[model samples]
Target: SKLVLTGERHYTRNDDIRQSILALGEPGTFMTQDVNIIQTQIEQRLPWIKQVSVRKQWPDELKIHLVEYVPIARWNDQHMVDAEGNTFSVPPERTSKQVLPMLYGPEGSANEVLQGYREMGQMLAKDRFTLKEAAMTARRSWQLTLNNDIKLNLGRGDTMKRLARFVELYPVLQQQAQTDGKRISYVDLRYDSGAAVGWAPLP
Candidate 1:
């Protein structure tokens, strides 16, 4: 549907005149102060917002139509992140199922890590595996958490090479798990040649 501006505009020649009059010393007639003006301004700034009409209903109840932003992840007890990387705590509270990947690095470093991880995910998508999450450590190396609950420490350079090595070993690891009923905790591929596998004891 088309949009419309319902309330009067602010910062007009009229308001300027009103301010001048108030400055000079007249205080009889009252104009619309700021409630309506500010609401209109907010509506104009947000395109997706249809309207910000405030109404007083029956029994002194106030009716408001609010648009909420969906949270993608929770960083800690206090901060939650939205789909657009905006951090907030109020509304659409975080949950265990919504626990998302985290990235840590110097300022303005997330974009690079996010881009690299995205590319690696696409490259590895054909093997029925997904990069569940990734983190960039203080050393600037990367760590990845696979959906299968396997942690990968991709230290140093050539992360794609290490990822490719993991992809090649996937079938071998799958077969070993099926045969031995073992669960691998991690596969460290930061070394030069082979993967060092470690597992948890079966109970």
Candidate 2:
């Protein structure tokens, strides 16, 4: 029995799905093929496929409706992650063109880091500061890199407080930058009392 794959605009190709089905066994007749078994195989083998519904259509067709992982951010050069923190290898066609925030974190920390990323975006969106990257070190420290190349050292714990402080003081910093014609390169928010600033060297 041949399998038909259908889903969103970007997804696994038909040939790949077909090849996987063919590998299971020789195509059996409608009466002999176990639809449930074939469906289980697809779900177990394909990480990109979030959900699949296999139905035996008329004659010799096996209809497969797949719900694919919706990519939210690039995990690395070759992988992408979804809102649920599930990661999958970026399909070859999308590797070069995906424009998403880069995230780095310890193993098994994808969900935590992804939530942090979303929170940072919400806090920074008001200022129109786009997040370019975020990293969480093994020591559990965190930092953010913005589209303007400004890095925010949020560090371990008190991250939300520091982020709040940054959001509150961002307007003041913007004004100072505009007045002095200096580009703010980095801001260290690890300190409890106040934040430290770093300026770009004058050219």
Candidate 3:
């Protein structure tokens, strides 16, 4: 049986994907093996093919539609996550030129992490602020590192309200921060009534 790979044969990664399938699986007749069983074996190679459409041609041919993951953010440490929260691998060399937010969460937490990151960006966008890093802590509390290198501890409950507090008071905090002849580095928003700002030392 002959195999014909389908994709925009324009890049090395595409070649990598096609080469993986070829090296990983032996050609099987459509009648002899179901496509499910075929794909099941191919998945083990860690080859990232996002959407695969399989079709059986009459005489003796099979077509596999191919697409790779379009990553939106970094996951755990080395993996990348697509907008749908699916995780895939990209080598360290490929990390540059792509400015994606570094996000962390426990295993099986990708979906929740991605959604929270999206919500965080939207919330901070109103203040003309931005997120540099975000995480759901080991203790399950939400924490955000802002663009200014100031870490904000959002705690667990009422995070939406807690961040709302910081978003409103950040200017005031900075004013107080600068009056002290230092800048703000970390703000603990874990408190119910107010935040605790830890001042950066004078330069």
Candidate 4:
């Protein structure tokens, strides 16, 4: 019996999936080949598959349908994280080449780190600033770099509030930089009452 496997145009890893299934020998024996077993095998071997369904088709065929993960950002250097903060790995060649933000954090902080990244992106978007990357140190302090090369040290605790405050003060700082013929090198927004700014001398 021939197996019927559906392909998704967006999921480029279907070729690999098909090859792996075929490596498991035939999917024809009705008594030996259970749909649940097949589904488990596929999901276990392919981390990029978000959801999969396997069922017997008529008398002598097996059918498989699956959905792949939609990656939002890169985790560290090797893995991808989806919108719900689920981490998965694909081949290096299969990973996205688009310039997405890099997110870093401790082992158990993926969800928290992803939430912060999303919130910061929305707030910064109001001013047309795009986030390039974000890193969380072992001490739990956080920092982010903007696409324009501006770096921000957000530290820890109430980070979103601190960022909102910083956004309000950013225009004033930009104006000051223009007047003084200086450019901002970095800004530390960890303080409760004020932010620290480092400036570069005008060329």
Clash tally, candidates in order = 0, 0, 0, 0
Span of 10 residues, lowest total lDDT, candidate 4: 23-32
Q: Residues 105-199, candidate 4, lDDT per residue (tens digit)?
A: 88767777898888898999988778888888778788999866789999877888988888898888889998999977799997788779998
Q: Show the lowest summed lDDT stretch of 10 residues, model 2.
A: 26-35
Cα RMSD, each candidate: 10.7, 3.0, 3.8, 3.0
> Cα deviation in Å at residue 87, candidate 2?
2.5
Which stretches of candidate 2 lie above 4 Å from their native place? 1-3, 25-37, 178-181, 201-203
Query: lDDT per prediction?
Result: 0.57, 0.79, 0.74, 0.80
Q: Pick the candidate with the highest TM-score.
A: 4
The estimated TM-scores of all candidates read: 0.58, 0.81, 0.78, 0.82
Which prediction has more favorable TM-score, 1 or 4?
4
The residue ranges of model 1 lying beyond 4 angstroms of the native Cα positions read 1-99, 201-203
The per-residue C-alpha lDDT of model 2 at residue 9 equals: 36
Error of 3 at 157 (Å): 1.8
* Model 3 lDDT per residue over 85-167, tens place: 89887667655678878899998898898888899889998878778788997677988888878799999887888888889
Best by lDDT: 4
Output the lDDT of residue 168, model 3: 89
Better of 1 and 4 by lDDT: 4
Q: What is the lDDT of residue 102 in candidate 3?
A: 86
The candidate, 2 or 3, that scores higher on lDDT is 2
